[PDB]
Design a protein around this motif. Structure first.
Motif, PDB file in Angstrom:
ATOM      1  N   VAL A  32       1.277   5.616  -2.988  1.00 10.65           N
ATOM      2  CA  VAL A  32       1.292   4.901  -1.877  1.00 10.65           C
ATOM      3  C   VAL A  32       2.459   5.199  -1.020  1.00 10.65           C
ATOM      4  N   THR A  33       2.602   4.874   0.264  1.00  7.50           N
ATOM      5  CA  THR A  33       3.888   4.918   0.965  1.00  7.50           C
ATOM      6  C   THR A  33       4.987   3.985   0.556  1.00  7.50           C
ATOM      7  N   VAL A  34       4.520   2.962   0.034  1.00  9.64           N
ATOM      8  CA  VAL A  34       5.235   1.530  -0.669  1.00  9.64           C
ATOM      9  C   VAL A  34       6.193   0.955   0.679  1.00  9.64           C
ATOM     10  N   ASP A  90       4.608  -0.271   3.308  1.00 12.51           N
ATOM     11  CA  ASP A  90       3.880  -1.845   3.526  1.00 12.51           C
ATOM     12  C   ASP A  90       4.451  -2.673   2.675  1.00 12.51           C
TER      13      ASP A  90
HETATM   14  N1  LIG Z   1      -3.389  14.655   5.759  1.00 12.64           N
HETATM   15  C1  LIG Z   1      -2.665  13.727   5.534  1.00 12.64           C
HETATM   16  N2  LIG Z   1      -3.217  12.662   5.263  1.00 12.64           N
HETATM   17  C2  LIG Z   1      -2.189  11.676   5.301  1.00 12.64           C
HETATM   18  C3  LIG Z   1      -0.576  11.852   5.366  1.00 12.64           C
HETATM   19  N3  LIG Z   1      -0.186  10.649   5.173  1.00 12.64           N
HETATM   20  C4  LIG Z   1      -1.194   9.663   5.009  1.00 12.64           C
HETATM   21  N4  LIG Z   1      -2.324  10.217   4.850  1.00 12.64           N
HETATM   22  C5  LIG Z   1      -3.634   9.654   4.457  1.00 12.64           C
HETATM   23  O1  LIG Z   1      -3.469   8.141   4.970  1.00 12.64           O
HETATM   24  C6  LIG Z   1      -3.858   7.217   3.797  1.00 12.64           C
HETATM   25  C7  LIG Z   1      -2.760   6.377   3.523  1.00 12.64           C
HETATM   26  O2  LIG Z   1      -3.015   5.897   2.036  1.00 12.64           O
HETATM   27  P1  LIG Z   1      -2.029   4.762   1.717  1.00 12.64           P
HETATM   28  O3  LIG Z   1      -1.284   5.100   0.687  1.00 12.64           O
HETATM   29  O4  LIG Z   1      -3.120   3.660   1.311  1.00 12.64           O
HETATM   30  O5  LIG Z   1      -1.424   3.999   2.976  1.00 12.64           O
HETATM   31  P2  LIG Z   1       0.152   4.244   3.240  1.00 12.64           P
HETATM   32  O6  LIG Z   1       0.293   5.690   3.245  1.00 12.64           O
HETATM   33  O7  LIG Z   1       0.287   3.450   4.422  1.00 12.64           O
HETATM   34  O8  LIG Z   1       0.554   3.857   1.905  1.00 12.64           O
HETATM   35  C8  LIG Z   1      -4.204   8.339   2.790  1.00 12.64           C
HETATM   36  O9  LIG Z   1      -5.569   8.034   2.306  1.00 12.64           O
HETATM   37  P3  LIG Z   1      -6.153   8.609   0.805  1.00 12.64           P
HETATM   38  O10 LIG Z   1      -6.388   7.530  -0.007  1.00 12.64           O
HETATM   39  O11 LIG Z   1      -4.883   9.569   0.235  1.00 12.64           O
HETATM   40  O12 LIG Z   1      -7.205   9.621   1.006  1.00 12.64           O
HETATM   41  P4  LIG Z   1      -7.908   9.587   2.476  1.00 12.64           P
HETATM   42  O13 LIG Z   1      -8.227   8.317   2.934  1.00 12.64           O
HETATM   43  O14 LIG Z   1      -6.980  10.179   3.647  1.00 12.64           O
HETATM   44  O15 LIG Z   1      -9.087  10.446   2.209  1.00 12.64           O
HETATM   45  C9  LIG Z   1      -3.793   9.756   3.344  1.00 12.64           C
HETATM   46  O16 LIG Z   1      -4.934  10.627   2.797  1.00 12.64           O
HETATM   47  C10 LIG Z   1      -0.371  13.175   5.765  1.00 12.64           C
HETATM   48  O17 LIG Z   1       0.913  13.472   5.909  1.00 12.64           O
HETATM   49  N5  LIG Z   1      -1.276  14.024   5.761  1.00 12.64           N
END
Ligand SMILES: Nc1nc2c(ncn2[C@@H]2O[C@H](COP(=O)(O)OP(=O)(O)O)[C@@H](OP(=O)(O)OP(=O)(O)O)[C@H]2O)c(=O)[nH]1
Ligand SMILES: [Zn+2]
Lengths: 101, 69, 230, 104, 223, 48
Positions: free
Chosen positions: B1-3, B5
């Motif tokens: 996660v991004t940690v 939040d």
């Molecule tokens: N392509 C792309 N996607 C990003 C990027 N940053 C975040 N995401 C997507 O946003 C989602 C955020 O995941 P979390 O960890 O729950 O939220 P957070 O980033 O705020 O902590 C992720 O879903 P996920 O659970 O990883 O899978 P999905 O829901 O995207 O399918 C990720 O795929 C990026 O730089 N590029």
């Protein structure tokens, strides 16, 4: 100039308050410098400031968070329990290989 | 996660990690792994981070949990 | 003859009033790109439509956008608002004319305001400009129905600002290809389509109409009726 | 010299330049700008990825140090560098560093 | 304002070169049709090629026959280039070749069994320095290219059986161009093939496959 | 995201990704459709 004073002092707390030539104090002591705050020093044209440092740190076999000031990697005050020495040693060493003379 | 939040409620990025680890251990010892829910849902360690992000669990409450066990 | 697999999965989600997303799965490798490109082109320029082409504000009185007018909106902003207007044209009428002449003082302007030729329906209540109740001002809109996209050589030719005509309800396709697994062979592609429309027709029905035209063309060289049975 | 190669290209009937018009296969639309096309004779070096995978989970340990063998000769496995330990210390992930050194 | 396309096999040229052209187009649907035809023929066409060859006297590919200039691996390479045309219902068949010639063996030397057709009479399977008896069996089945990763190796029952890779697709090159007659367009496509399948039939098959794929969209349903 | 040694980000594009953006950003004094007015990004994308 090569290095601007604001860029050099950026991210660094001020050990003592700064008094303008007009006699009105601009910044209180123990205040962390910020990019918004940095603009005032150039605007007030203060070329000299006093800032806290690790050498000046009075803690025994330790570094206070304030003396380090901004971590500079997360744009926040350095958190406790972070090893400043290891990062500092590695950062100087890595750039050396690219430089030759 | 991004940690990122999780960081709003918790401070230093280290206390949050320790609290999440303790919560995950407690959940695993809770018998949560019946095996009918693990496949359909994410692992417990991520679940503790999700609970911290909601803020429902409460960092202060988690310390109280250790005394119970 | 292993038998070409069918996607066998359809997912439809609407996240916008005129915007919908379509997801396909289980496509053969490289099938998604070939299907997606043709569908996008046909929907964007293969659909017949009627749109405003020429706008005249004061009988050619207004020569440039810089010219000041008695309203809160500049001539360019007013032209942008007029172009956004959507018009449905009757089969009998090949042309549509819209008149925006207003003598009212400090009165809000809306699609309901303005007399139109028979066979023209606004279909919307989009706002145009706020009147300043100043000197008399006029608006002229010319409507034509065409298929495909027509470019305009000159933005302004005489007294009317020339605009290109999209001539299509669909405004966005933005098709994308993603990997999918149907079993031991995971090379199969997954296609997601996002469509935005003026709202004259529903996005799904418009997509179906676009698909039908491609099928209709091969009817002479192929049997469409047998393909439907299955 | 370049002039002789240009004369040879003219004899072939190609334009007096390496770049030529090309069309993308997926959309069939020609790219703006001509692209040079050459035989570019190539060779394959003796570095196959088949023997480099070196996947190991559990392996025999050195008799004197009770430590895993390395180089993939038997079960191989990746040694952990001292510099990597410095990076772990900079990260502050003590739990990862403590577990890797003893149980692993 | 209705236009329906037609298929003409015109401007046939070369040993196996054809330029199928459609007089009628929708004035803008021509480019999409050309792109679809080019993509479908290359990866959708199915051809039948030898997948298994058994030599009379060999235990493995890396062996040298007596009085034969060609190597067993070289013979397998010559066999792969061989072009075969098969009946629609044949699906799979076995070909027996036995020769006592002291000259050069050839694909035409293959027994003329029903259904089996050999386009490459000129290609020679092997050359014999001295008179000898040479026989081999090659299995032929209909197949299409599903890519290198998704390929079944194929079971071998006999000790002498040798696995041989086969390129099922028969279309070497596909080219398309668009000409506008005014209010309408004409689509010109250049197709290069081994000659196993007639060009007009191949074009019709590719269009049929494209129509079958597009059939699901109008329905907007799982089935 | 930022380097520990310096605030500058280490995730910036290094080679071709920057080149394509630089090529698209460049402007031409004379081009087809010059002086055209587009209300929204979607309209410009449809025109392209
Ligand atoms: N392509 C792309 N996607 C990003 C990027 N940053 C975040 N995401 C997507 O946003 C989602 C955020 O995941 P979390 O960890 O729950 O939220 P957070 O980033 O705020 O902590 C992720 O879903 P996920 O659970 O990883 O899978 P999905 O829901 O995207 O399918 C990720 O795929 C990026 O730089 N590029
Ligand atoms: Zn200190």
């Amino acid at each position: 100039v090569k290095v601007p004073l604001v860029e050099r002092a950026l991210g660094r707390t001020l050990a003592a308050d700064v008094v303008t030539e007009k006699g009105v104090v601009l910044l209180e002591a123990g205040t962390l410098l910020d990019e918004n705050l940095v603009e005032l020093l150039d605007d007030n044209g203060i070329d000299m400031i006093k800032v806290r440092s690790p050498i000046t740190c009075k803690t025994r076999r330790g570094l206070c968070a304030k003396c380090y000031g901004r971590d500079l990697a997360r744009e926040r005050q350095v958190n406790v329990g972070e090893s400043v020495g290891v990062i500092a040693a590695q950062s100087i060493g890595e750039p050396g290989t690219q430089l030759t003379m | 996660v991004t940690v990122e939040d999780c960081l709003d409620k918790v401070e230093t990025r280290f206390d949050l990690v320790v609290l999440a680890s303790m919560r995950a251990n407690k959940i695993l010892k809770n018998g949560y792994s019946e095996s009918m829910e693990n496949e359909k849902k994410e692992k417990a360690t991520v679940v503790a981070l999700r609970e911290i992000a909601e803020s429902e669990i409460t960092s202060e409450q988690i310390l109280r949990n250790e005394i119970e066990g | 003859l292993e038998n070409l697999l069918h996607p066998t999965n359809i997912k439809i989600d609407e996240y916008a009033k005129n915007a919908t997303k379509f997801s396909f799965e289980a496509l053969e490798r490289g099938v998604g790109y070939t299907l997606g490109f043709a569908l996008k082109q046909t929907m964007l320029y293969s659909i017949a439509g009627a749109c405003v082409t020429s706008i005249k504000i004061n009988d050619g009185k207004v020569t440039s956008l810089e010219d000041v007018i008695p309203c809160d909106e500049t001539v360019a902003d007013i032209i942008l608002n007029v172009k956004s207007l959507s018009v449905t044209l009757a089969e009998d009428v090949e042309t549509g004319t819209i008149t925006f002449e207003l003598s009212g003082s400090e009165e809000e302007i809306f699609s309901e305001e303005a007399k139109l030729s028979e066979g023209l329906a606004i279909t919307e209540e989009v706002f145009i400009c706020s009147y300043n109740g100043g000197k008399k001002l006029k608006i002229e809109a010319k409507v034509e129905k065409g298929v495909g996209f027509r470019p305009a050589q000159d933005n302004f030719k005489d007294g009317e600002f020339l605009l290109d005509a999209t001539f299509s309800p669909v405004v966005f396709c933005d098709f994308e290809i993603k990997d999918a697994r149907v079993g031991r062979r995971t090379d199969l592609d997954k296609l997601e389509l996002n469509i935005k429309t003026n709202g004259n027709v529903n996005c799904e029905e418009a997509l179906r109409l676009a698909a039908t035209k491609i099928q209709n063309q091969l009817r002479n060289i192929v049997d469409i009726e047998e393909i439907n049975k299955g | 010299k370049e002039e002789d190669i240009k004369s040879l290209l003219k004899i072939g009937g190609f334009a007096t330049n390496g770049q030529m018009k090309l069309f993308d296969g997926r959309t069939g639309k020609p790219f703006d700008r001509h692209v040079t096309v050459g035989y570019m004779y190539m060779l394959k070096l003796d570095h196959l990825v088949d023997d480099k995978m070196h996947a190991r989970s559990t392996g025999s340990y050195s008799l004197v140090t009770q430590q895993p063998l390395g180089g993939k000769a038997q079960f191989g496995g990746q040694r952990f560098g001292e510099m990597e330990v410095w990076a772990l210390q900079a990260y502050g992930a003590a739990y990862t560093l403590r577990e890797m050194l003893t149980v692993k | 304002l209705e236009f329906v396309p037609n298929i003409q096999l015109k401007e046939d040229l070369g040993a196996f070169s054809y330029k199928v052209q459609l007089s009628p187009v929708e004035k803008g649907m021509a480019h999409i049709l050309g792109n679809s035809i080019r993509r479908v023929l290359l990866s959708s066409l199915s051809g039948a090629s030898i997948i298994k060859v058994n030599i009379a006297n060999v235990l493995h590919e890396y062996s040298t026959l007596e009085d034969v200039k060609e190597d067993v691996v070289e013979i397998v390479s010559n066999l792969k280039k061989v072009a075969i045309k098969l009946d629609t219902g044949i699906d799979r068949l076995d070909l027996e070749l036995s020769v006592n010639k002291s000259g050069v063996v050839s694909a035409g030397d293959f027994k003329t069994t029903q259904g089996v057709e050999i386009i490459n009479k000129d290609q020679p399977i092997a050359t014999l320095t001295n008179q000898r008896a040479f026989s081999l069996t090659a299995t032929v089945s209909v197949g299409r290219n599903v890519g290198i990763l998704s390929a079944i190796p194929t079971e071998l029952e006999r000790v002498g059986d040798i696995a041989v890779d086969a390129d099922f697709n028969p279309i070497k090159r596909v080219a398309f161009e668009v000409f506008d007659n005014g209010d309408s367009e004409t689509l010109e496509v250049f197709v290069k093939t081994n000659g196993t399948i007639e060009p007009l039939a191949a074009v019709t098959k590719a269009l049929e496959y494209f129509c079958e794929q597009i059939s699901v969209f109008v329905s907007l349903r799982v089935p | 995201i930022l380097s520990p040694a310096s605030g500058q980000p280490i995730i910036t594009p290094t080679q071709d990704i920057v080149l394509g953006l630089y090529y698209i950003t460049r402007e031409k004094e004379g081009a087809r459709g010059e002086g055209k007015l587009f209300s929204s990004y979607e309209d410009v994308s449809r025109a392209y």
